[PDB]
Paper text:
[name] is a member of a yet structurally uncharacterized subfamily of the [name] of transcription factors that downregulates transcription of the genes for the BusA (OpuA) glycine-betaine transporter upon c-di-AMP binding. [name] satisfies the overall domain architecture of the [name] with its N-terminal winged helix-turn-helix motif (wHTH) and a C-terminal effector binding motif, an RCK_C domain (regulator of K+ conductance). Our structural data, supported by biochemical and biophysical data, reveal that [name] utilizes a unique domain assembly with a tetrameric coiled-coil in between the binding platforms, serving as a molecular ruler to specifically recognize a 22 bp separated bipartite binding motif. Binding of c-di-AMP to [name] induces a shift in equilibrium from an inactivated towards an activated state that allows [name] to bind the target DNA, leading to transcriptional repression.
We purified and crystallized a construct comprising only the RCK_C domain (Leu135 to end) and solved its ligand-free and c-di-AMP bound structure to 1 and 1.2 Å resolution, respectively. The crystal of the RCK_C domain in the c-di-AMP bound state contains the physiological dimer in the asymmetric unit with one moiety of c-di-AMP bound. The c-di-AMP binding pocket is localized in the cleft between αR1 of the two RCK_C subunits in a conserved hydrophobic and narrow pocket formed by residues Ile153, Gly154, Val158, Ala164, Thr165, Ile166, Pro181 and the main chain of Trp159 and Gly180. Residues Asn157 and His160 form a polar rim around the pocket. The high-resolution structure of the RCK_C domain explains very well the high specificity of [name] for c-di-AMP and how it discriminates its ligand even from structurally closely related molecules such as its linearized variant 5′-pApA, or c-di-GMP. The adenine base, especially its amino group forms hydrogen bonds to the peptide backbone of Ile166 while Ala164 at the same time prevents a larger group at C2 of the adenine base, thus preventing c-di-GMP from binding. The 2′-OH group of the ribose is coordinated via a hydrogen bond by Asp157 and the phosphate group forms a hydrogen bond with His160. The individual monomers are identical and the resulting assembly is symmetric, therefore all protein-ligand interactions are mirrored on the opposite site of c-di-AMP. The apo and c-di-AMP bound crystal structure of the RCK_C domain show that c-di-AMP binding induces a subtle rotation of the RCK_C domains that results in a widening of the binding pocket. This movement pushes residues Pro179, Gly180, Pro181 and Phe182 (chain A) further out in respect to Trp159 (chain B) of the opposing chain.
Residue numbers in the entry:
A (entry chain B): 135 to 210
B (entry chain A): 133 to 213
Write the structure that this text describes.
C-alpha cells in the first residue's frame, strides 16, 4: 500500500486541471493519496484539487499504474 | 506518518454495505480516499468506483483523525458513542 511518487515537471495538457476534471482513476488506474505543492501537502485531495507543474503526486496502484501515470504526465 | 492508511473492519450492519464505492460516493460522504479493500483475505489496491464493500471487509483509507471519525460513523462503528 506504499505510494508511488512522481514530480510533474514536464509540460503537459494535464497540468492546470483538477483531479476530477482529469478523471484520473479512469485515465491511469491510479488513486491519488496526496499532492505536494510548494512543499506543502494535501492528503485525500478530492476532485477539486488542482495539479500544477512541479507538484508531486503520491498515488497507489501497481507497476502498470505507475507506468500509465508517467506516460500520462509526459515523464518519458 | 500522515500518509499511513487507517484501517476499519466493517463488521456492523449498515445501509452502506453491498454497495459500490461510486454508489456510496465515499470521498464526498466522509472525506476519505480508499486505497485498498481486503475481502476474504484478498487485497484490491486502487479499487475504483465499481469495487463493492461487503460486511467484514477491511477498508484502508487516507485522511486525518476527523476523516477517520466520519468513516467510523458512516459504517455504524460507533459502539453506542
Ligand atoms: N478510492 C476512492 N475513495 C473514496 N471515494 C472514491 C474512491 N473511488 C471513487 N470514489 C467516489 O466515487 C466517485 C466516482 O469515482 P470515479 O473513480 O468514477 O471518478 C473520480 C476519479 O476518476 C477522479 N478522482 C477523484 N479523486 C481521485 C483521486 N484521489 N485519485 C484518482 N482519481 C480521483 O474524479 C472523479 C470524481 O471524483 P469524486 O471524488 O467527485 O467522486 C468519486 C468518489 O466520491
Amino acid at each position: 500500500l506504499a505510494p508511488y511518487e512522481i514530480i510533474v515537471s514536464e509540460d503537459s495538457e494535464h497540468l492546470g486541471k483538477s483531479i476530477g476534471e482529469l478523471n484520473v482513476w479512469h485515465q491511469t488506474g491510479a488513486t491519488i493519496v496526496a499532492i505536494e505543492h510548494e512543499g506543502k501537502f494535501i492528503v485525500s485531495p478530492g476532485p477539486f484539487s488542482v495539479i500544477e507543474q512541479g507538484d508531486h503526486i503520491f498515488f497507489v496502484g501497481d507497476e502498470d499504474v505507475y507506468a500509465r501515470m508517467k506516460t500520462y504526465f509526459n515523464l518519458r
